Amino acid sequence: PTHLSVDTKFKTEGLCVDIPGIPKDMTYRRLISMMGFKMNYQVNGYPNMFITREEAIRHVRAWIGFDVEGCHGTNLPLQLGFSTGVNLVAVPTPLMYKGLPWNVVRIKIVQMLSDTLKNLSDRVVFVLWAHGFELTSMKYFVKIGPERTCCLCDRRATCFSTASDTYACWHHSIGFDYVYNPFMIDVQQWGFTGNLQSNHDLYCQVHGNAHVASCDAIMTRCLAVHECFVKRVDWTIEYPIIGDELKINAACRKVQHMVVKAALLADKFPVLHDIGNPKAIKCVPQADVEWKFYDAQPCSDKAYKIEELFYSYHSDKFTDGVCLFWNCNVDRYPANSIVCRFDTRVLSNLNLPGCDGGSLYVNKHAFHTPAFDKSAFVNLKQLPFFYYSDSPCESHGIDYVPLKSATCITRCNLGGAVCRHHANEYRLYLDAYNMMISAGFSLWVYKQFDTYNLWNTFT
């Protein structure tokens, strides 16, 4: 039960229009052979070109939707579409390139996958809604063999160069022409009734069908994402570290502690309603406040309707005190709220494009987040940056430049000059805050929040 067996049956019904007379009885072994690839009984880490749904989910960062549409098939030119929005035309002799021979097309394919994937994954997973041409065209840009390492580094090889007879990862593949040991999955094998557009449109209104190959490639990967992350949710799956994951998570924990501590000091709420993650711990352990928890797992489909989290008859009165929605995405927040809401629009190596405007945020775990909506925050306002500290002004134990700032809410700044300790802690906190903002997170607070109320907590 490790990899997908090559002797597993492959349903060929979706392939019989491009490939008439295709055998109904088909294995991955016979299919790979029909595609022009010789697996040669090789026990060298690449057991099958196709992968399981579980293997695909573990490698979601590698997904590239791929679709080939016949323009006019060895006689006709093909249109190669990718979920990157790229459309290449291969002559056999929404970016739309004119017809070019395969030897130049393959070079472009390696450039595009390398630039899209080098900071995401150690491989490519071509996500298909297989009809024939995409599988028969792979011999023109894909080479297979034993698992290899990069000529310039220790990462696995994902490319091959016929010109130099060498292999490279996605980072050292400049000038490489072949895709080496790609992975693939046919979404049609999961059992669907009807075509791609009818299944995709059941869950997504953001990707139209402009009737080009890349449009289908986009709808394919989107449908795959909905099936694997929207309706099916697995938070036990671990994902490798590819960037600032640890810093972003540390920063988010510092910002939450800071923002919640200050709201409780400024407005002295008697009760706080913590709506979100059922495993949450009090972010401000020493706060006076009555801390009440409400369990609500991350919503991956649509944002929670505030009515279904609060009503149908807990303090019951969420209107008493303040409500904390730390990454708990709701359709419209109540006015007495402290809110952290991930902005799905953010461009990043952690944030992958998702379904219905949403995004797949992959940081240790994969969280499909519903589309960001500015109207969720109409009863709230954007939370401004501030650093608050009631700790003593004491250095203990990095060269200094005097800190001058209106947002350093400390006793030293109240009394005129900011001390070295609060200046180091202010700069560190501003860094953590900037990290979290640029990671996509947005902070919102109740309209009456005013940091001016924090100065009298020093006397």
DSSP secondary-structure letter at 74? -
Element (H, E) at 310: helix 306-310
422 near Zn ion, rule: CB under 5 A: yes
Q: Which residue is nearest to ligand K1A (CB)?
A: 83
Name the binder of 393 from Zn ion, ligand K1A, none, CB < 5-8 A by kind: Zn ion
Query: Looking at 150, 215, 264, 309, which residue binds Zn ion (CB under 5 A)?
Result: 150
Q: Verify binding: residue 284, ligand K1A, rule CB under 6 A.
A: no
221 binds ligand K1A (CB under 6 A): yes
Asked if residue 207 belongs to a known ligand binding site, the reply is yes
Residue 64 binding ligand K1A, by CB under 6 A: yes
Q: Is 328 annotated as a binding residue?
A: no
Under a CB-based contact definition with an 8 Å cutoff, are residues 131 and 22 in contact? no
CB 41 within 8 A of CB 57: no
Of residues 201 through 230, those in contact with Zn ion by CB under 5 A are: 204, 207, 222
Query: What 3-state DSSP class applies to 409?
Result: strand
Residue 150 is labelled as binding a ligand: yes
On whether 274 is known to bind a ligand per the annotation, the reply is yes
Catalytic member of 18, 69, 186, 356: 69
Query: Rounded distance, CA 156 to CA 311, Å?
Result: 53
Structure tokens at 136: 């028969």
Closer to ligand K1A by CB, 276 or 353: give it.
Answer: 353
Contact 272, 322 (CB under 8 A): yes
Q: DSSP per residue over 323-392, as a string? A: EEEES--BSS--SSEEEEEE-TT---SSEEE-STT-EEEEESEEEEEPPP-GGGGTTEEEPPP-EE--S-
User: What are the counts of helices (DSSP H) followed by strands (DSSP E) for the chain?
Assistant: 10, 21
Question: Token pair for residue 79?
Answer: 């249109």
Residue whose CB is less far from ligand K1A, 63 or 441? 63
Choose the catalytic residue: 18, 59, 131, 134: 134
**Residue 63 Cβ, how far from ligand K1A at the closest point, in Å?**
6
Residues 164 and 221 sit within 8 Å (Cβ to Cβ): no
The answer to whether 254 and 432 have CB atoms below 8 angstroms apart is: yes
> Which candidate in 211, 238, 316, 399 is catalytic?
211
The two three-digit tokens of residue 26, written as one number: 């088909």
- Cα dihedral 4, 7, 11, 16 sign: positive
Per CB under 6 A, the segment of 37-45, 60-68, 286-294, 387-395 that binds ligand K1A is 60-68
Report whether 355 contacts 226 (CB < 8 A).
Answer: yes
Does residue 211 carry a catalytic annotation?
yes
58 binds, among ligand K1A, Zn ion, none (CB under 5 to 8 A by kind): none
Which distant-in-sequence residues (6+ apart) come within 8 Å of 315 by Cβ?
A: 271, 273, 290, 292, 321
To the query of whether residue 201 is one of the catalytic residues in this protein, the response is no
Question: Between residue 336 and residue 365, which ones bind Zn ion under the rule CB under 5 A?
Answer: none
CB-wise, 349 or 424, nearer to ligand K1A?
349
Work out whether 417 is an interface residue with Zn ion (CB under 5 A).
no
What residue 254 binds from ligand K1A, Zn ion, none (CB within 5 to 8 A, per partner kind)?
Answer: none
Question: 280: which 2 tokens?
Answer: 């949450």
If contact means CB under 5 to 8 A according to the sort of partner, which of ligand K1A, Zn ion, none does residue 152 touch?
Zn ion
Question: Cα dihedral angle (90, 139, 178, 196), rounded to 10 degrees?
Answer: 70
Size of the site for ligand K1A (CB under 6 A): 11
For residue 83, the partner it binds in Zn ion, ligand K1A, none, with Cβ less than 5 to 8 A by kind, is ligand K1A
67 in active site? yes
Enter the tokens of residue 115: 């630039």
- Contact call for residue 106 and ligand K1A (CB under 6 A): no
Q: Which helix (H) or strand (E) holds 213?
A: helix 213-225
**Considering only 63-71, 333-341, 363-371, 392-400, which stretch makes contact with ligand K1A by CB under 6 A?**
63-71
352 binds ligand K1A (CB under 6 A): yes
Instruction: With contacts defined by CB under 6 A, name the span among 61-69, 187-195, 402-410, 441-449 that binds ligand K1A.
Output: 61-69
Catalytic (active site) residue 216? yes
Going by C-alpha positions, the residue among 318, 280, 316 that lies closest to residue 296 is: 280
Can 69 be counted among the known catalytic residues? yes
CB of 134 to ligand K1A, least distance (A): 15
Interface ranges with ligand K1A (CB under 6 A) = 63-65, 83-84, 116, 120, 218, 221, 352-353
Residues tagged active-site = 67, 69, 134, 211, 216
Bind-site residues for Zn(2+): 150, 153, 169, 172, 200, 204, 207, 222, 393, 412, 419, 422
